[PDB]
Structures are given as structure tokens and as C-alpha cells.
Amino acid sequence: MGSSSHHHHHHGSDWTSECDVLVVGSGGGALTGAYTAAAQGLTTIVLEKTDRFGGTSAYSGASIWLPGTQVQERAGLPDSTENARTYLRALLGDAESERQDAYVETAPAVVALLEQNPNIEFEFRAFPDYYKAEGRMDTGRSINPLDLDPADIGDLAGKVRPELDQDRTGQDHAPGPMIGGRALIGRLLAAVQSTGKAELRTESVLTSLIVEDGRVVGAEVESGGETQRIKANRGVLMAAGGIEGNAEMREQAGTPGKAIWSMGPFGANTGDAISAGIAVGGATALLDQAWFCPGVEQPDGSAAFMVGVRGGLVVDSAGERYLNESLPYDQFGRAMDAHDDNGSAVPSFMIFDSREGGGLPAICIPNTAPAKHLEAGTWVGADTLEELAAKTGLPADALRSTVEKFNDAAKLGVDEEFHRGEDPYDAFFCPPNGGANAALTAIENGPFYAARIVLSDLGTKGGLVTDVNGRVLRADGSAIDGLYAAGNTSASLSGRFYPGPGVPLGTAMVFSYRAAQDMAK
Template identity: 50%
Template sequence: MATTSERPDETADVIVVGSGAAALTAAYTAAAGGLRTVVLEKTDHVGGTSAYSGAAIWLPGNPALLRAGVADTVEQGLEYFSAVVGDRTPADLQKAYVSTGPELVEFLERDPSVAFTHQPFPDYYDAPGRIDGGRAIFPEPLSAVRLAGRRAVLRPPIGVDQYGVDQDRETLVGGQALVARLLLALDATGLAELRTGVRMRSAIVRDGRAAGVVAETGGKTFRLLAERGVVLAAGGYECDDTLRQRHHGLPGASWTSSAPDSNTGDALAAALEVGAAIDLMDEAWWCPATLFPNGHAAFTLGLRGGVLVNAAGERFANESLPYDRLGHAMHEGQATGITHVPAWLVFDDRFDNLPAVTQPVPDPDAFRRAGLWRSAATLPELAELIDVPVDALDKTIARFNGFATTGVDEDFQRGKDPFDRFFGTGEGPNPCLVPVERAPFHAVQIVLGDLGTKGGVRTDGDGRALDTAGDPIPGLFAVGNAAASVAGHVYPGPGTPLGSGMVFGYRAALRLLSQPDDRSDRS
């Protein structure tokens, strides 16, 4: 822990550590309210995992939903969220998240650079208050020309950044558009400074209060004092293999959807140093992921065909589940002693590529050369190639094909839920049940990826970091994946990570704005 026995090198009103959507929302709110704000980003690019995302934002009853004619209210959204999450997280925290969504969207859209629209994407659970068409809103696409000088620092899409694919970047969509719009709004305040290549090393504490940070850039350490407070929004610890093994018992640093070398738990370590309490360290925003030849793994969802089998050659879940639930099934299956990570997606030759949504799209030839895609003229031959029992795979496929004929998955109810059918394209009685019958047969390796970890600092409804006694640590806030998720062990709907991170970033900044200016006490 650093102290401030000497004058700090620099001062600001608010320091925000990180540059994803939660961080930029906090920074923009603070700066728009008149506070001198400095954003510190460890890497050379701005946007974090948010820049990779599809940018769904889950905020019940917000103005963009109402404009689209979606009949939704905060009360209905809270009913659903509470039913799904249960009492794993505090009720007042859940209420703070859900009830603030409309206010946040209204506030952000006051800036001409920020605009949202609704797109259908079902909620993930069959629970009271659910909306089958979903509550997700997305940023409107944006011309990259609007970014001007900021264009070079925007983190590229994941396909470009991690896999080297060519992609049109003239029109920004999804996470690219979200980060870009927040950057434009932040710059327009005239009170925010954004620094890249700066890594937080520790928190500065003065009289029991978080008063700034010790940071490093270009091999040199400096101190930056915060007159009002420090907002930790630097993501989780998904890029650190040691922490992954300690808390999850699984590998995964190279399989995460986060940018390599970005989220290594810096904010978590700093918060622990000053006595913060932590929670949900065994959790992540899980997802099946297609393992690529370069060792990275691409977030995979929306399976249109095929079956997932474990090392025993057996199905273990509804393959059309929302990605976090399917990821949990892989994680829980691994604990049985039967290998589920990796699993194999087995499908037939009616599909000319992976029957799922993934970015980038696999190159079958490159995958075959790497041993990640295996093909055979018969199922017994395929079973030998992927090292599963021949009789078991044959029985699994025969049983599944029978379900495809009747339209009813008697084992896992695939295709029963509206979310399942959102992606189904089959022509039989159940669009999610596509028989595996046309030779040659294929198997692609699927690992357990994530959209970031969920474990972090325990916080209150304003994003204030709590100590082990449950009391706020003065001056310290944690939002986004730096905080223990309000969603607990579940993923209620598309855009919960971004929605909750942005809400608590906004609420943290409002709390900072409401505090009296005490800089005269910090000379």
C-alpha cells in the first residue's frame, strides 16, 4: 500500500482505472458534472472487452425499449431479475441496478453522440417477468470518421485483434460503436483526460481514504491524487492463469474473450491491499468457445445443429441453452471426472462450416491441420478420431436422431424454450433438432471460454467498495467486472454485464458528484 507522505506528482478530481463501457460511463458522468477526470488504461487501446462485444445492454423499461414499442417496466424487469438471481446478491443492489436503467439511458442520450436502439434477443430464463423478445438495446452504428484522432486508440474487433482477419472498420457496430460513442461524449466535456499505456500498481491511502493511485508508464512510476475518489473499472482477472487456476480450477487465460494481457487482476489486488471484501471468485461469464489454431478460443453461441459430447461420447446438456448456462454445464461436467473441457461438437455434412455463431468464422482446412476439426466417413471412424467410445457415440447419435424425428428432446428439452428457437433453422418438427446422418461426419473441439470473470470487490448500490465488515471504504469504488456481479451465479439476459457495469459506473459518478469538495484538506 502506498502512502502520501510527499506531495503527489499530479492531481485530478476523479481517477477511473480502465476504459471499457463501465469505465467510460463513470468518467463521462463525472466529467459532464464538472469534475476533472483522468482515465487510465493499461494497454495501448481503449475499450477493453466492451470493444469486442456485441454491445447488448440489459436495462428494463428504458426509453429505447419504449420507442421500439416494447411493453416493459422497471417493476417487471425487477420481478424477472430477482426471480432468476434469488438472494445470492443483496436485494437493494439488484434494485439499484434495474431501477436506474431508464435514467441512465435518458442521461446518455442527452449527448448527441450517444444513441441506442432495441433489437430482439430473448431473456435467458423461463421466469416471471420474462420478455421473449428480450430487453436488450444496442448502440446505433457510427461512422469511424467521427472518431478523428481517437480512431487509432480504439481497440479493434476481436477478429482483427486476436486472429488477424480482414474486417471493414469504416462503419462501427456493436462494441466498437458503443465505446466510440462514449469516447465522443467524454471528449466533448472538455474535462477528461485519457491516458493509454498506464498501469495501476496500487492505491494511495490517506487517513483511511482512497486518495489516488500509484501508476506506471514507460518503466517509470508516478502518483496521481484524486480529490473525490478512485473508480476501479479495469475488468477482472481472466487473463491471469495463476488466478484462474486458484479460483476456478481450470485453465482459461488464453481462452477468454478479453484482450490478451489486459485484465490480470490489477484492480482486485489494489482493492485487497486496502481491505476490500471480495465475492464470487469462483464465477465467470462462461461460454462455450471454439478453440482456434493460434491457441485463442472464440465465443460461440447459437448452435444451429450438431450435438456436444464429452469424453464418454455422451450428450450432457441442451446444446441450444444460452451460452452461460451451457458453459456452466461444461464446468459442472468437468467436476464429475469425465472430461467435458474440451468437448466435441459433432455434426454432419449438411453444414459447410461450424453450425454456430462465432467470430471469426473458422477456416476448416487450417483447423484440420491443427487437429481441431476431424472428419470421417462413418461415425465409428469419427469416434476413434476424437477418442470417445465407439458404441457410446453411435448410441448418442441414434437417440438424438430419433428425437429429431419426433421433434421432442426427451433428455434435455432442446428446442422447447423461446431462446432455443431464436437460433433454430432446422426443417423438421423442431427447428433445433437437426439429425446427424449425412456423411462425412465432423467434430470440432469446444473449450470453456468466458466473457470475463465475475468475482471481485463487494460493493453497495452506488458502487462503493465495501470492507470485510460491510462498510464503505471512503473514496474507493468498483464497477464492471472489477466488482462482484449483481447477477450472482447466473446470467439473466443479453447485456447484463454491460448494463450492470454502466449503471454502477453512472451511480458511482453521481455519488462522487454529490460529495463536498474537500480538496482544501489535501494540500
């Protein structure tokens, strides 16, 4: 993978083109880094491997954990840079304290620079922080790009990757404005283009970095069945995602879950940039870690992100509850993996009744029709729990017992076994009703359903070791000159934690910004 400049010269090759800043990828991080470089007058090229910008960032809800900024001040939030620092220190400990500090301390500058652009505006949207710890916001402190009329961004609207409910069925944007990740990437692209210093390319693939005397000076890029050599005078920012789509790297690293279960765009994030970085001496960390979530198994073997659980319960292959089904998706996923004994917890079984007329009582992204799950056998239905356990192969006495015990907890209003519905996260998706506890509803109105739940992800979070300025470090702690990484190309400062909504995009955006500031020196 690693190409030596002297070797290229020897073969008779030279630079196709030159820029100051070369950005690989086009999620929130990449485009934030692109904008930061180009807005202060550095010639910038962005390389997107696929025909659509945005990757998983486009799929996202575009909730962003950038605390203590002018956006939260407009909402009057009771929060601060120091309050957010306390929450991270309480969850993560002293491991990566310097990167924790740079994350919360730089959020305000990133947000102010971006909002100065007429294509970008954010607003606070309530979504709770995920753990009980000092500095938690029960309402959350995360911000979101405003809905975007695609007419405002010209030809860029047709180049944004569409939402999951359209993108895995050969479809483009559904009716209405661009929202969530579509609005984030549409606005960032329009900002990057407005600088007049950036080129935005699709179907341009990083293959290898180019090194001269141990310094990264550019990269080899495929585009139009041809090879190009792009020089980067100040540096290369690699924000091209993780290993989530590469089954071989995940099996080698011991990453739980599976490439086919990842909610990454199929084929996009195959660890190309992590590989390219290792090839020039970059150290790696946390490769067995990912941003986990439970997934509803699909007829085609893929998964759907299961979030905002509103009802049902979940059993292992023994027909027993083992977790709080309302847990934030990353803690849910880690509890599946911790409980899994040669396959008792992957798959798990979501059990629910006809309270939502056949629907599974959660948000599934994307949302496959019950009838297609039932025809494929991913879901099974029956008139009794007895017959449901027979069709699923679950122990019938244990499932019946599990459901009667859960139903007693819903009648009483407290789940003494797993404490479901006693957290602001659990309550956020459960509108207070006539029940003693809105997160606990009895499973008793037939027909009954079991859906197979697997260990999905929203990307992996392991990869190249970086400093507080996004510089890729070798095993000895020294910087690889000219090379930066951010987002899921870099090992997350968050370790084994998913602190709150928007940490993936927030960390990606801050370290892409800091990498561009470092290149501008």
C-alpha cells in the same frame, strides 16, 4: 501494493497531477462513469493500460440490459422497471436485493443522460432473456448503440480496440462502420471528450492506490517507462475488468476454465484493480465465478466463443449427450463444469455433418477456417461415425447410438432427453424450416466432424464487494473512502446467473454512473 502518502512524502515524492475523478479502465462502465463525472464539471482522467480503449467491452455485441428506459418506450415494448425487477428477484432471490433494486431503478437515468449527448443513441434489439421465470422477455428488452461512422469521432476511431476476428490476428478495423462494442466505445469516448473536462490516456497502468489515514487519495500509474502519482480529490473508479487473464489468481480462487480460454484481450485483465483494492482492505466475493461460455478450441490452445448453435450435438468423452446444446452459453458452460469428472466434459466434442459445407453449425468468435482446425487436430473429420470415433478416441458403439437417437428426435421433432428447441432462446437462432423442429437437424450427410469444446468465458464476475453506489467495502461492511469499483472489478449482483443479454455491460454502466453521482456529492 498499498502506498502511504506519508511514505511518499518521506521518499521525496509528490503528486505529478491532480483531478477530481480518476477512472482506471476504459470499457463501457469506466467511460460511462468518466462521462457522468466530466459532464457535470468534474475534471476526469481515464487510464487505459493497453494502447487501445474498450477492452472486452469493445469485443462485445454491445447488447445492454438497461430495462424500462426511454429507448424501450420508443419501441413500444410491453415491459417496465417493475417487470424487470420481478425477473431478477425470481432468478437471484433476496441475495443482493438492494443492488438489484438500484440496477433496474437507475437504468432510466443512465440512458437519458447518455442519449442527451449528441455522440450517443441506442435502440432496442431483440435477443431473448435466458431463463424461464416470471418477468422474462421472450424477445428480450436489451438496447444497443447505433452503428457509428468512424469519421464522426476523429482521431478516437484509431484508438478503439478492434473486433476479435481482427484483434487476435494483428489486424485493425475491417471494412464498414463501427458496430457492437466498437460503436459503444467509439461513442462513449466521443461523449467523454465533448465535455472538455476529461483526459483519455492509453498505455497508462494503475500499479497501486495511495492512501492517507485509510482514505484513497490517488494512485501510482506507469506511462512512458516512468511513474506518476495522480491525486483524485473526489475518488477513484476502478472499472478495469476481472481476473480472467491471470491463471495464478484463477487457480488460487478455484475459478473453472483457463486464462488461455478467456475471450478477454490477451494480457489486459490480470486482476490489477481487484489486487490494488484488496491491498487497501477491500473484501472480495464470487472469485470462483465467471461469465461462462463454451469455446471452440483453437490450434494455438486459445478458444472461440460458441454462440447461436444451429445444428450438431455435443458428447462427453463417453460419446453421450449430457445437455441441451441450444442452452444460453452461461448455462451450457455451467453444465460442462457440473458434468466434468477428471476430464469427461472439458473437453466435450461437437459432432456435425457437411450440412454447412464443413462449417461448424454455430457462430464462432473469432472464426478459424475448418482446414486450419483439421490440420492442427482441434477438429477431426471422417466418412463414417465409426472412423470419426476411432480418430477422436470416443467409444464407437456409444457415439453411433447417440447420433441415431438424436436423428430419431430430429425426424419426430422433440428431444425427449434434453428438450432442445422448446425455449424461445433455442428457437431464436433456428429459422423455422421443413423439419418438425428447426433446432433439431439429423446428422447424416458425410463427412462427419468432431470439434473440441472447452470452458471459455467473457470475463470473470468475482471481485471487490461494493454497495449500491459502487463503494468498495471492507470485511466489516464499512466503506473505503474515495474508492469505487464497477464491472468485473466488482463482485456481480448476478451471483451464479446470467439473466439475459447485456447484464455485464448494464450492471457495469449503472454502478459506474452511481459511483460518479456519489463522488459529485
